[PDB]
Ligand binder design. Structure first.
Ligand SMILES: [Mg+2]
Length: 275
DNA sequence: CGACGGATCC
DNA sequence: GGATCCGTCGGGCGCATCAGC
DNA sequence: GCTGATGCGT
């Protein structure tokens, strides 16, 4: 029931070396995460691009340590206007993106701080913090409408292949969480969110990088509730993903789950691409 | 949301 | 009568606001 | 300014 992520594979199936390392992390409160040494772990991981979710932090409140990152000097931040202290995403990059945008169509009016889009030379990167269905599923219908708008937004992008990463807030299949049967009526594992995920993969279209490499591997999770010592018992959920355009699969070296990195109730995930 | 109690099924 | 299904319930976290001093 | 309570989301 415990899990050990396999060693990093830094070579593509055809023998090409990885050239791009992307790390994604739901940090559950950026200021808290930094106090718990999250940035020390980022420095050790040394990614080319770092995507963060649930920053819960407007840009003016960013800790100074974030200014002290020479290898991640291009930084883009989004926080909601009417709900500061919740949501918020960030994208930090070694190289400057060609284009950066926010939201999924109307962010200038519906300032939600959930999505950042960055176009690079060879690919487009989207990072997302997908809305939670909430306790008792009170916001499930909103989540379903959001999924539909997100799907259409990703499909409606004006060429290059897509990388989508972040907290998509759903365990796609039973293998993606410890207690599938007890959670069928809970946020993150309803038939509605599971279906929205399958529709995301088919509509865009996208592949689940981790599952593509490790289709039958159980007990691989990226989230554990703080309650009941769930993490120590690896009672968790896989909520964080790297979804790729089909054309990027031959460039895929590995998709990692960094189970040991502490500082949040999610752990980091890391992608290696040979571009 | 995992732990728990209580019902139901071979 | 062990395994399974199902509904209910308490509670760890971070951050905003507030009361008090 | 600082602490701890409460509310909210989860
Ligand atoms: Mg969270």
């Amino acid at each position: 029931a415990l899990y050990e992520d396999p060693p990093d594979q830094k070579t593509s199936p055809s023998g090409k070396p990885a050239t791009l390392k992307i790390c994604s992390w739901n940090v559950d409160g950026l200021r808290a995460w930094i106090k718990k040494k999250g940035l020390d772990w980022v420095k050790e991981e040394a990614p080319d691009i770092l995507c963060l979710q649930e920053t819960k932090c407007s840009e003016n409140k960013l800790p100074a340590e974030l200014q002290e990152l020479p290898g991640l000097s291009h930084q883009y931040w989004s926080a909601p206007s009417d709900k500061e202290g919740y949501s918020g995403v960030g994208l930090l990059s070694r190289q400057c993106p060609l284009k950066v945008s926010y939201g999924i169509g109307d962010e200038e009016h519906d300032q939600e701080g959930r999505v950042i889009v960055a176009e690079f030379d060879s690919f487009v990167l989207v990072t997302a913090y997908v809305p939670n269905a909430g306790r008792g599923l009170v916001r499930l219908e909103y989540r379903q409408r959001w999924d539909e708008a997100f799907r259409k937004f990703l499909k409606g992008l004006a060429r290059k292949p897509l990388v989508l990463c972040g907290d998509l807030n759903v365990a796609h299949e039973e293998i993606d969480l410890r207690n599938p049967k007890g959670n069928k009526k809970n946020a993150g594992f309803t038939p509605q969110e599971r279906q929205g995920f399958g529709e995301l993969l088919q509509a865009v279209p996208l592949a689940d990088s981790f599952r593509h490499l490790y289709p039958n591997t159980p007990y691989a999770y990226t989230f554990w509730t703080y309650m009941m010592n769930a993490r120590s018992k690896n009672v968790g959920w896989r909520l964080d993903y790297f979804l790729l355009s089909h054309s990027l699969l031959p460039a895929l070296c590995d998709s990692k789950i960094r189970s040991k990195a502490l500082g949040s109730d999610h752990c980091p995930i890391t992608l290696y691409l040979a571009l």
